[PDB]
């Protein structure tokens, strides 16, 4: 998570 988006889910 960084900026305004997620690329790695949990």
């Amino acid at each position, epitope marked *: *998570k*960084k*900026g*305004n*988006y*997620v*690329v*790695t*889910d949990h």
Partner: antibody
Amino acid sequence: QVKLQQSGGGLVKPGASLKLSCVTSGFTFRKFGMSWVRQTSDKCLEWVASISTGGYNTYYSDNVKGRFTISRENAKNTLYLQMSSLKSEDTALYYCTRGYSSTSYAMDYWGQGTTVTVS
Amino acid sequence: DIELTQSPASLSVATGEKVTIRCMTSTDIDDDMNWYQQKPGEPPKFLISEGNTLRPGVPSRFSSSGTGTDFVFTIENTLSEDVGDYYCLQSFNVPLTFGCGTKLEI
């Protein structure tokens, strides 16, 4: 070694639908986010959509919201772009792309590009 | 929506000369600037990622710098094989946005 293999696309009339496929190899697909970005004849690049590792988070350009859907099937190492209600403005070379880090959609590997023409 | 504008739109250099290409953003991007090189009939190739760092395998003659909204890409000692279109990309926020390229000829 990382390979993004694209297929689908073609020439369709306005209002039509098209599903683009991107099959990946060479890495654990579920550990990476993926995106589609398109290149128009003016050679400008425009981000279309991004999807997180498991598919729980998706992001779309305002230009394709309500018409395109990005999805992935992790068991098949495949990324998809379902296009519907296509318009001439969507004519572009579409690229399959991998986010280079666990936190960024900045692209490292790119597929070879799939032509879609809407006319 | 962060806009990226590149400059010059194109340039022609002689072999062994330095090229300087710029990309400015409309707002801060936490140094998440990326640079690509694209040759005819190929996808863009990743040269520089976030934090102005050269990708492994890319020649050390390529560099980038800048912070805030003002970023630079340079090729010291340009070679004929560097002909192509160079693109910047911010990856700080979605929508991810690109400049529309600087065309390089030798």
